[PDB]
Design a protein around this ligand. Sequence first.
Ligand SMILES: NS(=O)(=O)c1ccc(C(=O)O)cc1
Length: 167
Amino acid sequence: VNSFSGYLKLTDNVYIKNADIVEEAKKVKPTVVVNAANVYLKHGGGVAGALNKATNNAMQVESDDYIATNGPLKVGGSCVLSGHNLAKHCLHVVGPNVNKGEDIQLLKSAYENFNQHEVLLAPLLSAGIFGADPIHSLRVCVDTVRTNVYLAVFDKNLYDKLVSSFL
Ligand SMILES: NS(=O)(=O)c1ccc(C(=O)O)cc1
């Protein structure tokens, strides 16, 4: 048993809810929250900027030190950093950004990072400003992630479409 509430079960291991991932993280304080990161860990908009804003910019300060030491992530890659006031850990995962021309086949590699963690709160990857089709992202998630993932979908209209079209 875990603390996640109000989710619709899609599969053995994937759950979904219409929720603001920031508000969900603040309530649950999960072991792992996933950030929809870019390779520079520049948390400017969407989930990364909202997560970073909710940490009072501490996520960005930590991230800048990580990049100064290690250089950029790979598209499809990840790093584990602090969860600050939102979670124990934040798993920063880089899905391909369609609006920058990245290979959508890298979306499966991105979701494979989730399998290193038993339970995660996470948004769909490559959605919103990354330019991928969220229906596709949910299908790759279900077909790739084997650990228990709790998906927060901000947009109520999209949530309803994801559920009603789910195979
Ligand atoms: N890639 S993003 O611009 O941060 C993004 C991620 C998820 C949602 C959503 O749940 O609706 C919206 C935008």
